[PDB]
């Protein structure tokens, strides 16, 4: 758009990226030099860019710029104390302990974040205490080093563990008897005379058991429920059989619509001749 020309937003974004890049280093300068002048100039650097794009509502640069404000604020807060409160004495004091035990630097900066801590920045030594307020987290320091220092010179006490000593002192059986080398339909076990709330056990259960996929029987000449049995892999593991189980989708599918409470049950009983429940 002509108003809020995208060139302005692009240039200010470049400027703020440069500001973030220079802050990433100037954190060290502020912590080392003992003053905060760099961040004080960064204030003007932020303000110029902020004012140069007022009156526009492209908002993607605000979150990152808030980082500059937080960084400058925290650096100022910690630097107010660190400018020598006793202008001549470099004490061995409370903050000395906490900052010193956290100074170890050999890996977690030298070889972790692609950075190097400069060596050159008794009274003057007070200015090297401020390089250890960035952690903001637990796992980024060498706790292994401090732990190892103990038990070596301090504890001077035995440490190990002793030997292991204390350790040293229904239709499934019907199908089985039917056999895979034959073909008997489902109607032989649903024709208990007028057990109208028991016949539907098998029709709705054994309708198209042909789906198993050992062999692909042609389209049924009748289409009504049917059942047949074959022997297949009997492996116990579940994961290893997924490929074989999914293989059996190869069977073709043809769908006729007939699904009702069958046209009369008399034509069913008179092709498999039983009248008592052989099932359980």
């Amino acid at each position: 758009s002509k108003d809020g020309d995208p060139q302005l937003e692009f240039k200010v974004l470049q400027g703020y990226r440069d500001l973030e890049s220079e802050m990433h280093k100037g954190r060290a300068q502020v912590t080392r030099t003992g003053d905060i002048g760099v961040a004080m100039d960064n204030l003007n650097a932020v303000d110029s860019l902020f004012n140069k794009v007022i009156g526009i509502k492209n908002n993607g640069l605000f979150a990152h710029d808030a980082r500059a404000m937080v960084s400058i604020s925290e650096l100022a807060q910690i630097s107010v104390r660190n400018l020598k409160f006793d202008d001549s004495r470099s004490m061995v004091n409370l903050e000395n302990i906490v900052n010193s035990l956290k100074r170890y630097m050999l890996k977690e900066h030298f070889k972790l974040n692609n950075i190097a801590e400069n060596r050159n920045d008794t009274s003057m030594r007070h200015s090297y205490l401020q390089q250890f307020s960035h952690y903001n987290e637990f796992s980024q320091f060498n706790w292994f080093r401090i732990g190892a220092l103990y038990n070596t010179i301090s504890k001077n006490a035995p440490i190990t563990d002793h030997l292991m000593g204390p350790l040293s002192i229904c239709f499934k059986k019907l199908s089985k008897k039917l056999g895979p080398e034959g073909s008997i339909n489902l109607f032989k076990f649903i024709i208990d005379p007028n057990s109208f709330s028991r016949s539907i056990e098998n029709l709705f259960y054994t309708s198209f058991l042909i789906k198993e996929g050992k062999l692909l029987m042609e389209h049924d000449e009748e289409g009504l429920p049917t059942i047949k049995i074959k022997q297949s892999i009997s492996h116990t593991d579940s994961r290893s059989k997924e490929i074989e189980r999914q293989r059996r989708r190869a069977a073709h599918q043809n769908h006729i619509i007939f699904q009702m409470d069958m046209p009369t049950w008399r034509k069913l009983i008179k092709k498999y001749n039983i009248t008592s429940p052989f099932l359980d």
Partner: protein, 277 residues
């Protein structure tokens, strides 16, 4: 050198129950790296002695012989604790004891092992990672190394930082002060267990009290109500002297050795009251 070793081989031969007692105390004291009490010792040892067709021995001679035996075999000694209420390094007279070695400490050797552990640090947990099923190295300890736990050195480091922060608190720190310190070290107060510890800071400090590394203080007031302070433990008193913590801060300083002058007395002043020597 063979003569003193044969002396142990002799005295142990006439005193099989001495072998029993020394083995038992070593194994038990190192089992949970904790203190051992007089009553339990005098009960179990006496039961074992009565079992081993011998009556109650003279504990002065037995104590001297145990000190000689374990100092020659392992260099350890069953040091006692000064009495809580009398605020001495008495002999076979105290009520609680703890094992401690008497090995001389060279200022060059242990540096290598501590550096090796601090280097095992770099690759095992790159960018905050952690070892286990994630890390392809099935034997993360590489079939052998000097870390020796990969699980308790963190606990030891937390213990050491707690001890030193108590030290500069002039042996007097409040419950909220240590909470604030731990928060500004990296330990969260929300209660979430530290991943490598599987334990919370309050649990850790109460366990240290159980191990007696630190001593709790109880006080009740109208204006503040319940509030707790902590004091260095007698175990630490017999375990840390001026020279030991001086060498601790000597490793801490990192800078030239020549500036060791004027540091001893400053370190002493930094804590003040720790014991009567």
């Amino acid at each position: 050198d063979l003569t003193e070793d044969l002396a142990v081989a002799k005295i142990v031969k006439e005193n099989p129950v001495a072998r029993k007692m020394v083995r038992y105390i070593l194994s038990r004291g190192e089992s949970q790296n904790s203190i051992i009490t007089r009553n339990k010792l005098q009960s179990v040892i006496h039961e074992a002695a009565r079992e081993e067709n011998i009556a109650k021995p003279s504990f002065s001679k037995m104590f001297m012989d145990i000190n000689a035996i374990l100092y020659n075999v392992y260099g350890f000694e069953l040091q006692g604790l000064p009495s809580k209420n009398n605020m001495e390094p008495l002999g076979h007279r105290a009520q609680k004891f703890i094992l401690l070695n008497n090995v001389p400490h060279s200022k060059n050797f242990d540096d290598f092992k501590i550096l090796q552990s601090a280097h095992t640090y770099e690759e095992l947990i790159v960018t905050g990672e952690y070892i286990g099923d994630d890390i392809a190295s099935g034997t993360s300890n590489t079939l052998e190394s000097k870390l020796s736990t990969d699980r308790d050195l963190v606990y030891k480091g937390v213990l050491s930082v707690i001890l030193c922060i108590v030290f500069f608190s002039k042996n007097n720190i409040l419950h909220q002060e240590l909470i604030k310190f731990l928060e500004t070290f990296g330990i969260p107060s929300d209660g979430s267990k530290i991943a490598i510890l599987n334990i919370t800071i309050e649990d850790l400090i109460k366990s240290l009290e159980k191990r007696e590394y630190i001593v709790r203080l109880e006080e009740k007031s109208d204006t503040d109500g319940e509030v707790i302070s902590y004091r260095i433990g007698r175990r630490t008193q017999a375990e840390l002297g001026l020279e030991s913590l001086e060498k601790l801060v000597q490793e801490i300083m990192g800078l030239e050795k020549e500036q060791t002058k004027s540091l001893h007395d400053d370190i002493i002043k930094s804590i003040g009251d720790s014991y009567s020597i």
